[PDB]
Amino acid sequence: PRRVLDVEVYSSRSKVYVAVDGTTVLEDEAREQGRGIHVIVLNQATGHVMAKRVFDTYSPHEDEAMVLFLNMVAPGRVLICTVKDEGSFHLKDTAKALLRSLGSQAGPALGWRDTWAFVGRKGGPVFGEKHSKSPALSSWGDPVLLKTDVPLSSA
Numbered sequence: 578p579r580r581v582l583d584v585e586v587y588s589s590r591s592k593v594y595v596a597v598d599g600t601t602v603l604e605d606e607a608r609e610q611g612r613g614i615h616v617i618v619l620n621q622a623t624g625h626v627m628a629k630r631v632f633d634t635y636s637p638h639e640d641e642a643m644v645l646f647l648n649m650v651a652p653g654r655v656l657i658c659t660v661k662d663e664g665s666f667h668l669k670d671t672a673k674a675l676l677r678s679l680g681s682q683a684g685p686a687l688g689w690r691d692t693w694a695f696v697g698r699k700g701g702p703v704f705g706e707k708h709s710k711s712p713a714l715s716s717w718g719d720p721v722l723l724k725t726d727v728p729l730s731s732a
């Protein structure tokens with residue numbers, strides 16, 4: 578609304594979405610597309626979407642692309658991450674260390690078919706995070722819907 582953004586972030590086996598101030602900026606419910614970690618970067622004064630990516634970190638090399646991308650994001654941006662299906666198999670140590678450095682608690686621990694939603698300032702702090710661990714190899718984490726108020730910059 579004013580000096581705040583209302584952000585909603587959904588992570589699940591079959592669907593991700595992100596809404597900012599009641600507007601859907603990401604929605605992917607397609608079968609067999611969009612696996613991995615979805616990353617949205619917002620301008621920290623307006624909430625406008627600066628970048629939207631998906632890294633299929635179930636597959637090799639995509640976490641390296643994610644690291645290169647995230648390292649170019651400015652510290653003040655709002656960073657949103659959400660998993661569709663599976664984002665951990667090839668989320669390797671450099672990517673996990675990068676998520677840890679953002680203050681993410683669940684990202685560095687992401688496991689097989691876990692669901693994960695994250696909203697934070699690139700240079701810290703984290704504003705909201707949710708995580709559900711998959712209970713079995715044949716299962717997924719529970720869908721998570723994170724609703725977070727994000728402060729906006731001004732002056």
Ligand SMILES: CC(=O)N[C@H]1[C@@H](Oc2ccc([N+](=O)[O-])cc2)O[C@H](CO)[C@@H](O)[C@@H]1O
Binds near residue numbers: 612635662663690
């Ligand atoms: C057909 C299917 O259901 N494929 C799915 C399966 O792929 C695999 C393939 C092999 C193994 N295995 O035997 O270790 C596990 C998951 O899981 C992936 C991660 O959730 C999905 O992206 C694929 O869409």
